[PDB]
Swiss-Prot record, chain A:
Purpose: One of the primary rRNA binding proteins, it binds directly to 16S rRNA where it nucleates assembly of the body of the 30S subunit.
GO molecular-function terms, A-Z: rRNA binding; structural constituent of ribosome
GO cellular component entries: small ribosomal subunit
Organism field: Pyrobaculum calidifontis (strain DSM 21063 / JCM 11548 / VA1)
CDD domains, per database record: S4
Pfam family, one: S4
Family as reported in the entry's similarity comment: Belongs to the universal ribosomal protein uS4 family.
PANTHER family: 30S 40S RIBOSOMAL PROTEIN (PTHR11831), 40S RIBOSOMAL PROTEIN S9 (PTHR11831:SF5)
Domain S4 RNA-binding residues, every copy: 105-157
InterPro entries noted in UniProt: Ribosomal_uS4, Ribosomal_uS4_arc, Ribosomal_uS4_CS, Ribosomal_uS4_euk/arc, Ribosomal_uS4_N, S4_RNA-bd, S4_RNA-bd_sf
Protein name in UniProt: Small ribosomal subunit protein uS4
Subunit annotation: Part of the 30S ribosomal subunit. Contacts protein S5. The interaction surface between S4 and S5 is involved in control of translational fidelity.
Swiss-Prot record, chain B:
KW tRNA processing (keyword) present: no
HAMAP family, sorted: Ribosomal_eS4 (MF_00485)
Gene Ontology CC: one annotated term: cytosolic small ribosomal subunit
Encoding gene, per UniProt annotation: rps4e
Keyword NADP attached: no
Organism classification: Archaea, Thermoproteota, Thermoprotei, Thermoproteales, Thermoproteaceae
Protein name: Small ribosomal subunit protein eS4
Pfam families from the UniProt entry: Ribosomal_S4e, RS4NT, S4
Organism: Pyrobaculum calidifontis (strain DSM 21063 / JCM 11548 / VA1)
Similarity-based family: Belongs to the eukaryotic ribosomal protein eS4 family.
Coiled coil start-end: none
Top-level taxonomic group: Archaea
Swiss-Prot record, chain C:
Taxonomic path: Archaea, Thermoproteota, Thermoprotei, Thermoproteales, Thermoproteaceae
Organism: Pyrobaculum calidifontis (strain DSM 21063 / JCM 11548 / VA1)
Similarity remark: Belongs to the universal ribosomal protein uS12 family.
Segment of the intact protein contained: 50 to 145 of 147
Name by which UniProt lists this protein: Small ribosomal subunit protein uS12
Keyword NAD recorded: no
Transmembrane segments: none
Claim: RNA-binding is one of the keywords in the record: yes
UniProtKB/Swiss-Prot annotation, chain D:
Record's protein name: Small ribosomal subunit protein eS8
Keyword hit for Ribonucleoprotein: yes
Gene name in the database record: rps8e
Pfam families linked: Ribosomal_S8e
GO cellular component: a single term: ribonucleoprotein complex
Chain intervals for the UniProt region annotation (Disordered): 15-36
Length: 157, 236, 96, 130
RNA sequence: AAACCGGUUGAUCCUGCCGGACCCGACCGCUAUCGGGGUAGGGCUAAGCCAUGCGAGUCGCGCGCCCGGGGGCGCCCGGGAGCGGCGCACGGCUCAGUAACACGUGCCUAACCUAACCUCGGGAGGGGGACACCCCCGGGAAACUGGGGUCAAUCCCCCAUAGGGGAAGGGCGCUGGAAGGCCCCUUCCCCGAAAGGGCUGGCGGCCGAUCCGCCGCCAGUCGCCCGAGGGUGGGGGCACGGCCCAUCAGGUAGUUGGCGGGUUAAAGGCCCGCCAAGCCGAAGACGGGUAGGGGCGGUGAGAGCCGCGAGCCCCGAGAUGGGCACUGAGACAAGGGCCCAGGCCCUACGGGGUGCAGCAGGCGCGAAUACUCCGCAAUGCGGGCAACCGCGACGGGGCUACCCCGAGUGCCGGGCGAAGAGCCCGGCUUUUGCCCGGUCUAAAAAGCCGGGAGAAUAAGCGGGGGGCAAGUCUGGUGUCAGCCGCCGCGGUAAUACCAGCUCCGCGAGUGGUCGGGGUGUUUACUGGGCUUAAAGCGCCCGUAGCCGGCCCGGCAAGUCGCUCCUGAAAUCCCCGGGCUCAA
């Protein structure tokens, strides 16, 4: 008798104890470097990071036969998004993946890391006002997680 | 009578969520609701000739579509296994055949085998005059004299002439023929009949098919004999 | 629940503390039972009158029972005449 | 007929003897029944054709005078006449009120016969001589 | 992230509760710019009462009549009131009854019916009638309704034959696991079809402009009747599965079964006549309480717990309470009928209507709630040969802090300011707000594309003694007022109250009270404890239950492995793709 409704997708990266000093210090650093809007964006990055790690955890627990069809395609898909660097690492190497690798794929970060803007908050403003063309199309969402192949197509107006 | 989109058969080539809350309901024709597709769905989805339901009804209303030699002007007419669908103004012919992916597919066929339909004998009844009536997998019937109808047992496949209302060729169900699975998980598979575990109910007998050397098993109910090493009519 | 204020009554804080927590007696409309409701905030009792509809709500505390030094009271006033008491106390609105 | 006065639906009693509630408030018309229509001994035959479920028809004998008595020892059928109802083993009150039911004895012209049809349902009295 | 932290002591180790931190659901407070996706909204409250409107029609290719325009061959077209066919038993709403063959899964009907439709085989001959609209009159407040005349049918009826039912005897034969079945033969009884109708074209004949038809035939097409099967819908049956209470222990008497009957479409104590004493129960009857069942949903690392098991889909039941019938394939019928109860409404006092658990809407209750809006374009359905028509189903938007997703409320440099806020200066951009055009949309709206001015139009909520991030800064009060989930403060120097300044958390949100889960190994299967903290019956005999020595042989029930038919869709996990990414 229950009707399904959507739930928050950033809950997996949300800490259940927000009032930790060292926790507040580390997260405040991350928002500063990458110019995020609120902690929801930061938690949304971690929720992606938990997916990549929890999926890799389960694939380790799967049998060798079961792991085989999914092992290489999983690493290859991670490589193409730009999270990882080698798509041929051991599967346990993905377990130590760090949340900054997901934050670098944000479209706002790439505009700043490509020297296309003065500051990271300026690069967010560039995407917001619609001066950043991704393969010729205006992509105005600064939190866009650009994959590897699309990265070289980023231009300004 | 309505048909909610949720209650539509799973294998139908329509989106499950996106669309209206309704689906076109077949009008009790020569098939089963679970194993038939209405004519308006075929004209709109499988052939893509109509973009709306009114356009599909318009195409059907002109008699452009022929199903087994009879022009069907009903947009809720059911189509099913081994049916011959012919589009008059374009001249294309299809035979709805068991498919490994779509579960039921419109395959083009040559014009020669368009009047032929392979029918599986579902049973026989004794009618007045002492004659025998044959019931086929799509509910079609054929009355025969008693001696000729004695030698056609159930599950035998007969190639039926829609043009002459006759039996071209009778294919008995014996071990060693070519069979196609017409229902169940193993649909679309064509292979040799080489193994049977005869149960107390013959319709529930376990049968095995081989294609060198992928072996699939089903029940005896779910396989149609299509002949010896050469299939009699194009199905794949 | 809703209720009608009858008399402004004062209960005394428990032994270690010393104060007169100012509550009111309310009769519930849906039941007719009479309950003692705590009026919070400094001067919040002054916004209460006799025969005014107030929205009665639980005071919190463990297990839905009474609060810390207030003995035997389970409810507190949140609304007076259809306006929130915190709004009146903060000046953001005025009582009707 | 389908009459709620002769409802043929299930009891409200469990096999343990305890009572159970009513799942359905109304009496379904499909589960309805009808009053008896077994014929009475009369001076002429009157047949009534009744429309029943699905647009079908049932032949009702309102008043019975002749019986199609059959002689097993001779293999002949005679449309003999009926004089009295000797006895009704299912219920004597059928014979007491001159009502013919299956299994009843009838003292026909040829002798005695046991009624071998359901005269409220078949609509004729097929009899076999004793 | 498989997590702990506060509090009983002078101090300590425990036990054990209560609190904090998290997610979701309802209601509420303060605040509130934009967009996208979504089956969110009087459910958790009275199945309480209702003003008003809209909510099932369609067919002239079944039928006659009337009217208007046109034309001569035999009519064309438009319209009207009707008869007639089919549909209105689908669709929409709600959750009282129900602890039950209601629901779920897996099987049956060899004990059954089914209009529309599909296939095979066969048939369509003879003869009659009535009633509407209409015309001449009405009656009545209205509802409704009377008499005479008069034209038809795919309207109604009869006759024939086919066919059908029953009883009885026989059989090679069929189906099927198995014939009380089908087929064939014989005897009797009984019931008993049809619309060759419409259209199109061709032929011929009768007839006449006061007719614009009628008749025979042929073909095409849409139809009608019978037999058999299928299909669909439905009636019925079975095995098993899913709440609490013993401060409820015996219950049942058509009750349990048998035989013979009636009724039914069909089996049945469904009902009836007779016969017996059986049937259920501590493996929990009976009684009470609660509840529509499922797909499923929330929460947790999981086992599990809970139902927010309201919204979407499937089944069920209901239409103010309780009953009973007509028609029909199907109802004992939400916008049909009749009766009782209980209301209300109009009235000319003689009557006649009505019950919104339909879509809007009003009153009422309550802590708690939307427009008396637009369209049949999409998705479907009924009707039609078709064209097309209708549809508060459905689609569209409005309102609403409904759920999720993406953003703004500026960016760069400089000075003052503190490295903050803020102020000012110089340069930049226009997401967004405003105006306009194209596109979109049934039409709007919003979206999208493009153009103009412009920093210009846009931040709150809760907190700073510990738990727990944030002030031993200042003013005021002085165990008063106030705070406080717990611990605990305040009685003159208050980091806990009221204020200023300042800082903290989250941010178009943030809080308060509730409910569920975690918390919690405080329900313990995983996985607790019982000497003394709560907890071994005072002791023993034993029924059900649970648990039980060794070896050999058999079966293969459990169990294990593979495969098949299944376990609706949606929901869930993984993978690919398409909306700018996202949802
Ligand atoms: Mg306390
Ligand atoms: Mg835990
Ligand atoms: Mg102490
Ligand atoms: Mg607790
Ligand atoms: Mg309600
Ligand atoms: Mg017609
Ligand atoms: Mg008309
Ligand atoms: Mg009509
Ligand atoms: Mg319904
Ligand atoms: Mg008359
Ligand atoms: Mg007729
Ligand atoms: Mg028969
Ligand atoms: Mg006749
Ligand atoms: Mg006639
Ligand atoms: Mg019987
Ligand atoms: Mg009984
Ligand atoms: Mg609703
Ligand atoms: Mg009633
Ligand atoms: Mg009714
Ligand atoms: Mg009502
Ligand atoms: Mg439409
Ligand atoms: Mg958001
Ligand atoms: Mg400075
Ligand atoms: Mg517009
Ligand atoms: Mg503040
Ligand atoms: Mg302060
Ligand atoms: Mg601290
Ligand atoms: Mg505090
Ligand atoms: Mg314990
Ligand atoms: Mg002892
Ligand atoms: Mg004791
Ligand atoms: Mg013992
Ligand atoms: Mg076994």
């Amino acid at each position: 008798g229950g009707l399904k409704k959507p739930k928050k997708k950033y809950l997996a990266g949300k800490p259940k104890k927000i009032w930790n000093k060292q926790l507040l210090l580390e997260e405040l650093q991350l928002m500063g470097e990458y110019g995020l809007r609120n902690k929801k964006e930061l938690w949304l990055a971690r929720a992606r990071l938990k997916w990549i790690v929890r999926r890799a955890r389960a694939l380790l627990s799967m049998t060798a036969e079961e792991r085989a069809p999914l092992e290489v395609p999983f690493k290859e898909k991670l490589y193409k998004m730009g999270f990882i660097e080698d798509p041929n690492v051991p599967l346990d190497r993905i377990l130590s993946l760090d949340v900054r690798a997901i934050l670098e794929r944000r479209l706002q970060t790439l505009v700043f890391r490509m020297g296309l803007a003065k500051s990271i908050h300026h690069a967010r403003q560039l995407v917001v006002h619609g001066h950043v063309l991704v393969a010729g199309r205006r992509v105005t969402s600064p939190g866009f997680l650009v994959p590897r192949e699309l990265e070289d197509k980023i231009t300004i107006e | 009578v309505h048909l909610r989109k949720s209650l539509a058969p799973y294998w139908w080539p329509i989106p499950r969520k996106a669309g209206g809350v309704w689906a076109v309901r077949p009008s009790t024709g020569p098939h089963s609701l679970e194993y038939s597709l209405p004519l308006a769905v075929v004209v709109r989805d499988v052939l893509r000739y109509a973009k709306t339901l009114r356009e599909a009804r318009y195409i059907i209303s002109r008699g452009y579509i022929k199903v087994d030699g009879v022009v069907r002007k009903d947009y809720k007419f059911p189509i099913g296994l081994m049916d011959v669908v012919e589009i008059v103004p374009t001249g294309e012919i299809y035979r709805v055949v068991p498919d490994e992916a779509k579960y039921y597919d419109l395959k083009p066929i040559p014009s020669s085998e368009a009047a032929l339909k392979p029918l599986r004998v579902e049973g026989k009844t004794a009618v007045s005059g002492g004659r025998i009536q044959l019931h086929f997998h799509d509910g079609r019937n054929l009355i025969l004299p008693p001696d000729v109808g004695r030698q056609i047992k159930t599950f035998d496949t007969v190639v039926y002439d829609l043009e002459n209302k006759a039996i071209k060729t009778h294919l008995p169900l014996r071990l060693g023929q070519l069979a196609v699975v017409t229902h169940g998980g193993n649909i679309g598979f064509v292979g040799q009949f080489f193994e049977v575990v005869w149960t107390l109910k013959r319709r529930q007998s376990v049968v095995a098919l081989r294609k060198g050397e992928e072996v699939r098993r089903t029940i005896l109910d779910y396989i149609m004999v299509i002949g010896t090493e050469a299939p009699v009519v194009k199905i794949s | 629940a809703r209720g009608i204020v009858l008399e402004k009554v004062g209960v005394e804080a428990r032994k270690p503390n010393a104060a007169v927590r100012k509550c009111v007696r309310v009769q519930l409309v849906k039941n007719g039972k009479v309950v003692t409701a705590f009026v919070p905030y400094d001067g919040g009792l002054n916004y209460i009158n006799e025969h005014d509809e107030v929205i009665i709500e639980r005071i919190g505390g463990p297990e839905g029972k009474s609060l810390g030094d207030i003995p035997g009271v389970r409810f507190k006033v949140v609304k007076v005449n259809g306006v929130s008491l915190w709004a009146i106390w903060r000046g953001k609105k005025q009582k009707p | 007929m389908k009459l709620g006065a002769f409802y043929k639906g299930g009891d409200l009693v469990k096999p343990s003897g305890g009572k159970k509630g009513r799942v359905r408030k109304t009496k379904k018309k499909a589960l309805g029944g009808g009053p008896p229509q077994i014929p009475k001994l009369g001076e002429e035959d009157i047949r009534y054709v009744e429309r029943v479920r699905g647009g079908n028809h049932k032949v009702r004998l309102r008043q019975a005078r002749y019986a199609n008595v059959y002689i097993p020892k001779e293999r002949r059928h005679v449309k003999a006449k009926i004089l009295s109802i000797v006895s009704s083993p299912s219920n004597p009150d059928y014979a007491r009120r001159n009502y013919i039911v299956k299994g009843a004895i009838i003292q026909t012209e040829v002798g005695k016969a046991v009624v071998t049809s359901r005269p409220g349902q078949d609509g004729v009295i097929n009899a076999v001589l004793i």
